[PDB]
Amino acid sequence: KENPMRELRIRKLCLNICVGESGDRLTRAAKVLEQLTGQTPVFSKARYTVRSFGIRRNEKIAVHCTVRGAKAEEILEKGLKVREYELRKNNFSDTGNFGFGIQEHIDLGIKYDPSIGIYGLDFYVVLGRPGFSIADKKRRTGCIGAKHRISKEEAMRWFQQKYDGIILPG
Amino acid sequence: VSPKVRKVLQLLRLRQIFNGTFVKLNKASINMLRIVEPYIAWGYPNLKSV
Amino acid sequence: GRRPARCYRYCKNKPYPKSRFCRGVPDAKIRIFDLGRKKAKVDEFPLCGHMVSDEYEQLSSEALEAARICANKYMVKSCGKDGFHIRVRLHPFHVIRINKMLQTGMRGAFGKPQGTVARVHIGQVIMSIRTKLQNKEHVVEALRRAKFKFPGRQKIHISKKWGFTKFNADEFEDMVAEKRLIPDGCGVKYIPNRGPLDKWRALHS
Amino acid sequence: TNTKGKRRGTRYMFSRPFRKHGVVPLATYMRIYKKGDIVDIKGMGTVQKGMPHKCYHGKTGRVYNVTQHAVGIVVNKQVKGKILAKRINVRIEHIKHSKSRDSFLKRVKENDQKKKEAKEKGTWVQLKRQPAPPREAHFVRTNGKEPELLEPIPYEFMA
Amino acid sequence: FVKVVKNKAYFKRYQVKFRRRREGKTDYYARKRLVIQDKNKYNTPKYRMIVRVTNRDIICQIAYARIEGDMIVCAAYAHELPKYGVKVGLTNYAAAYCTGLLLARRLLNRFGMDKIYEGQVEVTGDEYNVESIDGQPGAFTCYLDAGLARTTTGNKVFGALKGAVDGGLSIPHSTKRFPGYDSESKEFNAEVHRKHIMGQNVADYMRYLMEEDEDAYKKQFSQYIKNNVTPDMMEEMYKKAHAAIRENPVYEKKPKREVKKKRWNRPKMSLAQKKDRVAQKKASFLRAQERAA
RNA sequence: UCUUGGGGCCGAAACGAUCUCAACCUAUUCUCAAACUUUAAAUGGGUAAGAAGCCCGGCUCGCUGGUGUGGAGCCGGGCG
RNA sequence: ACAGAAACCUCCCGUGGAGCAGAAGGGCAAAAGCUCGCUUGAUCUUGAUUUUCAGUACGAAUACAGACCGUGAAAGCGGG
RNA sequence: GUCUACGGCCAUACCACCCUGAACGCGCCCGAUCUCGUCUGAUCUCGGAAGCUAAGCAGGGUCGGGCCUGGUUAGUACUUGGAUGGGAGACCGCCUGGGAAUACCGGGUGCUGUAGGCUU
Ligand SMILES: [Mg+2]
Ligand SMILES: [Mg+2]
Ligand SMILES: [Mg+2]
Ligand SMILES: [Mg+2]
Ligand SMILES: [Mg+2]
Ligand SMILES: [Mg+2]
Ligand SMILES: [Mg+2]
Ligand SMILES: [Mg+2]
Ligand SMILES: [Mg+2]
Ligand SMILES: [Mg+2]
Structure with a gap:
């Protein structure tokens, strides 16, 4: 019988919209995430100036927000539904996380408004077990230990049971 | 005569060639005699020598 | 084109490598240090002769290139192009300068790079040849002919080590049988009685 | 010539x-230094304040303040033909209590004890x-074993 | 393939941090400035008041540094508070105040200064500092060692500090980090602080939960119910604890009892045992190989 | 060795197959440093080897201070 | 998702292989780096000391002492 | 036997993986009213006590890497002082003293202070 403290959970869901440029588009994207998550997101600036991409250093080009708790489960369901609960094997990282892309946010049940437009966004799910927070605390930080980590196979296995999803090959 | 040999020969009181003295042997003195090795002939005198 | 090798025979200056302070050094004459059948396994060539320097001097990269050719050509003629493996054991790292005159004279006399040399000690191996045992006489002659490309005095010495390895030939065969030695191409890896016991399982399975 | 830089050659x-x-380590700061203490000066690059000048590295002095x-x-x-008693202000990271006298202070107490004890024993x-x-002079016992004969070894070219 | 970073050379060159740093327990940048005494004060001890709040306890200690290690001069634990009538909430702000008060009275009792420096016997929750009395032994002076805690307003380390200064210890501090300081107006409300010291924020929560959801109330305060601690009596419960702490702060050590020698973990294997184990493993491997063929 | 490339090579063609040579990685291996270094000499540079010491009792302090605590100074005494 | 060698998001390894204005050397990891909040110890003042040295000057630097201050919960730290 | 708080020295203490953890602890853990801080009660702060040693942590293991310490290397390399020593030189030998470092082989794998617990 498995220990109750070894059961997988969603540490957080991280939603990102790299608009690629500053100005009106980025602000509108900041409003799509707020509608979807119900919390104010944060803008991320460009680390470097890249001529090809047309982005300058310290220029806001993307907006993102982290969602935890029961809200993360609710929003994750919307995206996984749009994927028809189908993910590729390569969608899972070797550290036990996974994520997927959404091309239009309107598929997530967000009612379209003329002054916002249509955006895509990234979905990333960080999985975890209880006691993953020892590596995030200030006092007596530690490392969770080999036996407690989440493998790619354990993450894929969790996704199937949790959602009855399909892991396509490749 | 080099400075370190010149000082050690003065402490033995051998300030002139073919001068002689008795020196009672021990770690301190045997290592002084090693510094002045090129400048002295020494050894153990018998009762007749004394 | 260059000064006679008597002008740079002796190790008079501290080592002067090609570095970020000494820039503009021309390439060395010798660029190949191994020729013959380099790929022969450790066991094909048990015999190894050496050319050992009897002097503390500087060997120019031109003399190393010439000797290598002289020793290699003889081995090809007398042992075949695949009966031997030569290894030049000196690399010309010390840079020699020139203060080029036509006139300031000795004002600002620090010289520009002229060439490269190898600094060799007494008893230090200059070049090595490994082949089959029956070619012992052909190794000695090959190295005897190569002594004429060098200044100073050299000694030809037939090593008691097996090939280019560091292990004596009189016990190399047993060490391989007991698996203290594992052929690894031109040489052998040494297996100590240490480390994970899964390594021992691998070797003994 | 050389520069007159303060930290040249360090x-x-x-x-x-x-x-x-x-x-x-914080025991470096817990040492107690009193007036009259002998301390060896050893500059430490980690602390750049109160650094002794290079000439005082490896010297031993007496604490006066x-x-x-x-x-x-x-x-x-x-300095040339004279020796000056120099007064330097050094942070306590760059010093350590000298042991050079401890062997002496050990002997004094042993001397003072023995001198007192022997006196009351009249010895x-x-x-x-x-x-x-x-x-x-001493004896060296063979134990019925002839000493092992040693000979010089033949020359061998281990080149 | 990518280079192994943690190869042999990465370990040859590696320097470990201080053990207490590796453990994540000690901040040596802060410790140096806390424990180190001026060299012209020589052997004068530099006392500090260590406050560590664990998941279930509060440890209050008075220590000074020595080359062999810190010498604890006096300690007071929150697991002692049941002796003084406080059964539950041994990590809340009110408990921290009691633990700090117990630490102060216990030290002053030990030095014989408890009668001289009684502190602020009536808790007002306001700024108070003990001033030395001329012709009497001076007031004991220590500094607060807050460890790695985030010293924002309302941190319980300042609850214990308040309890210690109200007991008669001299600890430099301001009211900026007591609960009741308003960052907006930059004004300290002592009456808010007095509420936390008497645990009314907890009491208000119990009433709030009781009128919101009984099930939540039981989940949140199962042990308060088991011990019959109700919101009305909390303030008196703490006030009694202060009187009792002042009446008798001495600690009677638990009397040690001899026990049967019991070992609860394996000792090291000897060289012979380790060596023989490898021989058995080798024999086992070859034996299996011969059996298969 | 697919984590990338060049040659090939069977194809309807894909990370399918097949090799082959390189880059990469892993253990080895030859040869080096005035402006490299884990190690690390010899010779060398300070200091100490007493009465200006040691050990006792007391006194002054505006310095330090939970403390008659600390530190410094001063006075008297005993030890060759 | 667009997204590619390189945009942004996430997890993991990471002894410094970065950064600290500049030459190099030293030093530095809950910091000396990065980001925020508050500030003007880059202020006023007498002596002592160090470095070059003749034991002169300058310059630079080091311990203090007296004021005023900043910062911090505080120990402290700061007169570039 | 062992832990907690604060430490000293700062790998014999680190790193990797595996096994075992009685009691008390330390934890993971459960919440967000209050104090306090976040895009996010993840962290920080605060209020708790249903569950669990899964993890951290402690002890142990590995012909483990590292580290510590011995042996060998080796009286070798180098070196103080000496000669109207050798040798065309390069350099070398001897005399009088000092005297290393790899590879290779073995052994070890934290000690301990103050205060407070648990362990018939
Ligand atoms: Mg593990
Ligand atoms: Mg020259
Ligand atoms: Mg702090
Ligand atoms: Mg900081
Ligand atoms: Mg001042
Ligand atoms: Mg249990
Ligand atoms: Mg939580
Ligand atoms: Mg376990
Ligand atoms: Mg080992
Ligand atoms: Mg231990």
Whole structure:
């Protein structure tokens, strides 16, 4: 019988919209995430100036927000539904996380408004077990230990049971 | 005569060639005699020598 | 084109490598240090002769290139192009300068790079040849002919080590049988009685 | 010529030993330094304040003043044909109590104890040290074993 | 393939941090400035008041540094508070105040200064500092060692500090980090602080939960119910604890009892045992190989 | 060795197959440093080897201070 | 998702292989780096000391002492 | 036997993986009213006590890497002082003293202070 403290959970869901440029588009994207998550997101600036991409250093080009708790489960369901609960094997990282892309946010049940437009966004799910927070605390930080980590196979296995999803090959 | 040999020969009181003295042997003195090795002939005198 | 090798025979200056302070050094004459059948396994060539320097001097990269050719050509003629493996054991790292005159004279006399040399000690191996045992006489002659490309005095010495390895030939065969030695191409890896016991399982399975 | 730079030539002198960088152990700050103490000066590159000048690295002096962080040290310095008693202000990271006198203070107490004890026993005990004397006569037992004969080995060219 | 970073050379060159740093327990940048005394004060001890709040306890200690290690001069634990009538909430702000008060009275009792420096016997929750009395032994002076805690307003380390200064210890501090300081107006409300010291924020929560959801109330306060601690009596419960702490702060050590020698973990294997184990493993491997063929 | 490339090579063609040579990685191996270094000499540079010491009792302090605590100074005494 | 060698998001390894204005050397990891909040110890003042040295000057630097201050919960730290 | 708080020295203490953890602890853990801080009660702060040693942590293991310490290397390399020594030189030998470092082989794998617990 498995220990109750070894059961997988969603540490957080991280939603990102790299608009690629500053100005009106980025602000509108900041409003799509707020509608979807119900919390104010944060803008991320460009680390470097890249001529090809047309982005300058310290220029806001993307907006993102982290969602935890029961809200993360609710929003994750919307995206996984749009994927028809189908993910590729390569969608899972070797550290036990996974994520997927959404091309239009309107598929997530967000009612379209003329002054916002249509955006895509990234979905990333960080999985975890209880006691993953020892590596995030200030006092007596530690490392969770080999036996407690989440493998790619354990993450894929969790996704199937949790959602009855399909892991396509490749 | 080099400075370190010149000082050690003065402490033995051998300030002139073919001068002689008795020196009672021990770690301190045997290592002084090693510094002045090129400048002295020494050894153990018998009762007749004394 | 260059000064006679008597002008740079002796190790008079501290080592002067090609570095970020000494820039503009021309390439060395010798660029190949191994020729013959380099790929022969450790066991094909048990015999190894050496050319050992009897002097503390500087060997120019031109003399190393010439000797290598002289020793290699003889081995090809007398042992075949695949009966031997030569290894030049000196690399010309010390840079020699020139203060080029036509006139300031000795004002600002620090010289520009002229060439490269190898600094060799007494008893230090200059070049090595490994082949089959029956070619012992052909190794000695090959190295005897190569002594004429060098200044100073050299000694030809037939090593008691097996090939280019560091292990004596009189016990190399047993060490391989007991698996203290594992052929690894031109040489052998040494297996100590240490480390994970899964390594021992691998070797003994 | 050379420069008159203050830290010229201290590339190795002031660097920290191998795998001994980082925090300074706090017992370095808990040592008690009193007036009259003999201390060995050893500059430490980790702390750049109160650094002794290179010439005082490796010298030993006497403490004459103690402030909140530093001490005043009277340390001899030879300049040409004279030796000056120099007063330097050094932070206590760059000094350590000298053991050079502890062997002496150990001997005094042993001397003072023995002198007192021997006196009440009416006996004489040596108090002054002596240089190591020549070894005295002794017997060496063969145990019925002939000494192993040694011979020089033949030359071998191990080239 | 990518280079192994943690190869042999990465370990040859590696320098470990201080053990207490590796453990994540000690901040040596802060410790140096806390424990180190001025050299012209020589052997004068530099006392500090260590406050560590664990998941279930509060440890209050008075220590000074020595070359062999810190010498604890007096300690007071929150697991002692049941002796003084407080059964539950041994990590809340009110408990921290009691633990700090117990630490102060216990020290002053030990030095014989408890009668001289009684502190602020009536808790007002306001700024108060003990001033030395001329002709009497001076007031004991220590500094707060807050460890790695985030010293924002309302941190319980300042609850214990308040309890210690109200007991008669001299600890430099301001009211900026007591609960009741308003960052907006920059004004300290002592009456808010007095509420936390008497645990009314907890009491208000119990009433709030009781009128919101009984099930939540039981989940949140199961042990308060088991011990019959109700919101009305909390303030008196703490006030009694202060009187009792002041009446008798001495600690009677638990009397040690001899026990049967019991070992609860394996000792090291000897060289012979380790060596023989490898021989058995080798024999086992070859034996299996011969059996298969 | 697919984590990338060049040659090939069977194809309807894909990370399918097949090799082959390189880059990469892993253990080895030859040869080096005035402006490299884990190690690390010899010779060398300070300091100490007493009465200006040691050990007792007391006194002054505006310095330090939970403390008659600390530190410094000063006075008297005993030890060759 | 667009997204590619390189945009942004996430997890993991990471002894410094970065950064600290500049030459190099030293030093530095809950910091000396990066980001925020508050600030003007880059202020006023007498002596002592160090470095070059003749034991002169300058310059630079080091311990203090007296004021005023900043910062911090505080120990402290700061007169570039 | 062992832990907690604070430490000293700062790998014999680190790193990797595996096994075992009685009691008390330390934890993971459960919440967000209050104090306090976040895009996010993840962290920080605060209020708790249903569950669990899964993890951290402690002890142990590995012909483990590292580290520590011995042996060998080796009286070798180098070196103080000496000669109207050798040798065309390069350099070398001897005399009088000092005297290393790899590879290779073995052994070890934290000690301990103050205060407070648990362990018939
Ligand atoms: Mg593990
Ligand atoms: Mg020259
Ligand atoms: Mg702090
Ligand atoms: Mg900081
Ligand atoms: Mg001042
Ligand atoms: Mg249990
Ligand atoms: Mg939580
Ligand atoms: Mg377990
Ligand atoms: Mg090992
Ligand atoms: Mg232990």
